[PDB]
Structure 1
Amino acid sequence: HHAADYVLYKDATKPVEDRVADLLGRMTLAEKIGQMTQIERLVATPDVLRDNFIGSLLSGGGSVPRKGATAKEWQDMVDGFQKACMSTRLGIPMIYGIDAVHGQNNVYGATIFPHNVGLGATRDPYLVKRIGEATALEVRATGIQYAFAPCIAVCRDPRWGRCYESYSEDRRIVQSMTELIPGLQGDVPKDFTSGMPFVAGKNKVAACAKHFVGDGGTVDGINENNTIINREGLMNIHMPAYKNAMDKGVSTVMISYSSWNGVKMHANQDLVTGYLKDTLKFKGFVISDWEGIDRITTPAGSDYSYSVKASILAGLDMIMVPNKYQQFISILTGHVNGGVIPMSRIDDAVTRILRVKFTMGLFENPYADPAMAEQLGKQEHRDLAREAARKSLVLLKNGKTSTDAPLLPLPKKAPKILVAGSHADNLGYQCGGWTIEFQGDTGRTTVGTTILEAVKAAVDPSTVVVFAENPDAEFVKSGGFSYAIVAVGEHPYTETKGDNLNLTIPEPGLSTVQAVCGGVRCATVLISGRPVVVQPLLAASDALVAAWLPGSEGQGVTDALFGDFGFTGRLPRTWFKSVDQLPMNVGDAHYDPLFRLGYGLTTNAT
Structure 2
Amino acid sequence: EQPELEARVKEIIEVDGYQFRDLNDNGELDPYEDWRLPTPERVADLVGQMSLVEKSGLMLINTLNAACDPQTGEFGVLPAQADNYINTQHMHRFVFRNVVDVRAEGVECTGTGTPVVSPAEAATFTNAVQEMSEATRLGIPSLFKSNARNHIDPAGAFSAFPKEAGIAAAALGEQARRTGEATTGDMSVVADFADVMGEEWASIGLRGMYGYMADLSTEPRWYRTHETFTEDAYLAAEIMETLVQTLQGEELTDNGLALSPQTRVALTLKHFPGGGPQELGLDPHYAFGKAQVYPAGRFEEHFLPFQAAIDAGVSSIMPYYGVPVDVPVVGGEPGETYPHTGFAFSDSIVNGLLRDQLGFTGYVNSATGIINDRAWGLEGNTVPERVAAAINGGTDTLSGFSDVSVITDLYEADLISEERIDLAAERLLEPLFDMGLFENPYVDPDVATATVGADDHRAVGLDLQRKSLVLLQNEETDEGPVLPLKEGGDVYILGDFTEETVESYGYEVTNGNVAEGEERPSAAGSDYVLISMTAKTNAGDYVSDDPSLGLNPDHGTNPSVIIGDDGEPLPGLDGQSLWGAADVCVHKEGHEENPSCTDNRLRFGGAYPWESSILDFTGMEAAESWEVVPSLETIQEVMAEVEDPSKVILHVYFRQPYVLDEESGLRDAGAILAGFGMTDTALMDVLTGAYAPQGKLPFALAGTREAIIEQDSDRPGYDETEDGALYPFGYGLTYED
Quickly name the TM-score band, shorter chain normalised: 0.7 to 0.9
Which residue does the alignment assign to 1:442? Answer: none
Distance 1:578 1:26 in 2: 63
Is the Cα contact below 8 Å between 1:121 and 1:570 reproduced in 2?
yes
Distance 2:519 2:257 in 1: 57
Which residue does the alignment assign to 1:490? Answer: 535
Which residue does the alignment assign to 1:543? Answer: 671
Deviation string for 1:116-142 (max 9, x for gaps)? 122222224221222112112222233
Q: Which residue among 578, 595, 598 is the counterpart of 2:727?
A: 595
What does 1:315-354 align with in structure 2 at a 5 Å threshold? 315-322=394-401, 325-326=402-403, 329-354=404-429
Q: Percent identity?
A: 25
As a proportion of its length, which structure holds more helix?
Answer: 1
Residue 468 of structure 1, CA deviation: 2.9
What does 1:75-154 align with in structure 2 at a 5 Å threshold? 75-100=123-148, 102-103=150-151, 108-122=156-170, 123=172, 124-154=186-216
Distance 2:631 2:480 in 1: 25
C-alpha change, 1:264 and 1:198, in structure 2 (3 Å) is same
Distance 1:388 1:39 in 2: 33
Distance 1:265 1:579 in 2: 31
C-alpha change, 1:201 and 1:587, in structure 2 (3 Å) is farther
Which residue does the alignment assign to 1:534? Answer: 660
SS of the counterpart of 1:488?
Answer: strand
Is the Cα contact below 8 Å between 1:50 and 1:87 reproduced in 2?
no
Q: In the alignment, residue 435 of structure 2 is paired with which amino acid?
A: M
Q: In the alignment, residue 529 of structure 2 is paired with which amino acid?
A: A
C-alpha change, 1:269 and 1:65, in structure 2 (3 Å) is same
Which residue does the alignment assign to 1:360? Answer: 435
Residue 419 of structure 1, CA deviation: 2.3
Q: Which residue among 371, 374, 378 is the counterpart of 2:454?
A: 378
What does 1:247-396 align with in structure 2 at a 5 Å threshold? 247-261=311-325, 262-294=340-372, 295-297=374-376, 303-322=382-401, 325-326=402-403, 329-370=404-445, 371-396=447-472
Segment of structure 1 superposing worse, 92-101 or 291-300 = 291-300
Which residue does the alignment assign to 1:578? Answer: 704
Residue 453 of structure 1, CA deviation: 5.9
Are residues 1:455 and 2:494 paired? no
Residue 263 of structure 1, CA deviation: 2.7
Segment of structure 1 superposing worse, 571-580 or 497-506 = 497-506
Distance 2:222 2:296 in 1: 22
Residue 69 of structure 1, CA deviation: 1.5
Q: In the alignment, residue 432 of structure 2 is paired with which amino acid?
A: K
Are residues 1:170 and 2:232 paired? yes
Which residue does the alignment assign to 2:683? Answer: 557
Residue 291 of structure 1, CA deviation: 0.6
Q: In the alignment, residue 94 of structure 2 is paired with which amino acid?
A: L
Equivalent residue pairs, number: 561
Q: In the alignment, residue 201 of structure 2 is paired with which amino acid?
A: V
Distance 1:104 1:188 in 2: 29
Residue 155 of structure 1, CA deviation: 1.9
* Structure 1: 5+ residue stretches without partners: 426-451
Q: In the alignment, residue 49 of structure 1 is paired with which amino acid?
A: I
Q: Please, what TM-score do these two structures have when normalized by structure 2?
A: 0.71
Is the Cα contact below 8 Å between 2:537 and 2:605 reproduced in 1?
no
SS of the counterpart of 1:476?
Answer: coil
Distance 2:698 2:215 in 1: 13
Which residue does the alignment assign to 2:73? Answer: none
SS of the counterpart of 1:149?
Answer: strand
Is the Cα contact below 8 Å between 1:69 and 1:108 reproduced in 2?
no
Residue 152 of structure 1, CA deviation: 0.3
Which residue does the alignment assign to 1:510? Answer: 632
Distance 1:287 1:10 in 2: 26
Q: In the alignment, residue 384 of structure 2 is paired with which amino acid?
A: S
Q: In the alignment, residue 355 of structure 2 is paired with which amino acid?
A: K
Which residue does the alignment assign to 1:239? Answer: 303
Is the Cα contact below 8 Å between 2:700 and 2:729 reproduced in 1?
yes
Deviation string for 1:126-183 (max 9, x for gaps)? 2122211211222223321111121000122111110121111111121121145236
Distance 1:347 1:468 in 2: 64
Is the Cα contact below 8 Å between 1:269 and 1:314 reproduced in 2?
yes
Distance 1:176 1:455 in 2: 37
Distance 1:472 1:511 in 2: 15
Which residue does the alignment assign to 1:5? Answer: 28
Is the Cα contact below 8 Å between 2:384 and 2:406 reproduced in 1?
yes
Distance 2:256 2:152 in 1: 25
Deviation string for 1:529-570 (max 9, x for gaps)? 12212132533411111113x15x343322221112222122
C-alpha change, 1:533 and 1:590, in structure 2 (3 Å) is closer
Are residues 1:417 and 2:481 paired? no
Distance 1:297 1:234 in 2: 19
Distance 1:581 1:104 in 2: 30
Which residue does the alignment assign to 1:46? Answer: 83
Root-mean-square deviation (CA), in Å? 2.9
